[model samples]
Target chain A: FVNQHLCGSHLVEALYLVCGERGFFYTPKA
Target chain B: GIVEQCCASVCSLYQLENYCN
Candidate 1:
């Protein structure tokens, strides 16, 4: 998961922690 | 303009150039 394929893996990891599993539910509609 | 800019603020760009080497 830390590989280059993940690109902004660090940022993603931080966001994952901040957003948790329910993050998607709060996503704003287009 | 205010409302439109508010919604646009949520947009994020993952520009490849941003990840400078």
Candidate 2:
């Protein structure tokens, strides 16, 4: 069932916030 | 196909084809 896809998308968007805050280039500190 | 397309859109938005699982 594609229900798994729902969970996947939800989890992805959860981290999406972090990405937004830091920008997509979440590289290790240099 | 609504749900399927949704998944497609989300993945496409983030370019996360790997998380298509």
Candidate 3:
């Protein structure tokens, strides 16, 4: 089993640019 | 315990992104 991770924030930020919405999982949005 | 805290920020960062799902 592996004992580490390798998540890229830049990559996800790009994905966010495409999706373009950010919010919490357990709260109401405006 | 350190790893737990380390990943939380990263996971939460994306998981906050995950909310877009």
After TM-score superposition, the amount by which residue A22's alpha carbon in candidate 2 deviates from its true location, in angstroms, is: 2.4
Q: RMSD to native for every prediction? A: 12.1, 11.2, 9.0
- Per-prediction count of colliding residue pairs? 0, 0, 0
Query: What's the candidate order when arranged by decreasing DockQ?
Result: 3, 2, 1
lDDT, candidate 2, A1-30, per-residue tens: 222343344645633553454443211121
Error of 2 at A21 (Å): 4.1
- How much is the lDDT of residue A30 in candidate 3? 18
Decide which is better by lDDT, 1 or 2. Answer: 2
Candidate 3 residue pairs that clash: none
List DockQ for all candidates. Answer: 0.06, 0.06, 0.18
Residue A1 displacement in candidate 1 (angstroms): 19
For candidate 3, give fnat to 2 decimals. Answer: 0.09
Would you list the clashing residue pairs of candidate 1? none
> What digit string (tens of lDDT, one per residue) describes model 3 on residues A1-30?
112331345434433553465522322221
lDDT of 1 by residue, A1-30 (tens): 221222234444433544454442222232
Q: Report the C-alpha lDDT of model 2 over B1-21, residue by residue, as the tens digit.
A: 323433434323343332332
Q: Candidate 1 regions off by >4 Å?
A: A1-7, A24-30, B1-21
The candidates' interface RMSDs, in order, read: 12.5, 11.8, 9.5
C-alpha lDDT (0 to 100) for residue A4 of candidate 3 = 31
Cα error, residue A11 of model 3, in Å, equals 0.6
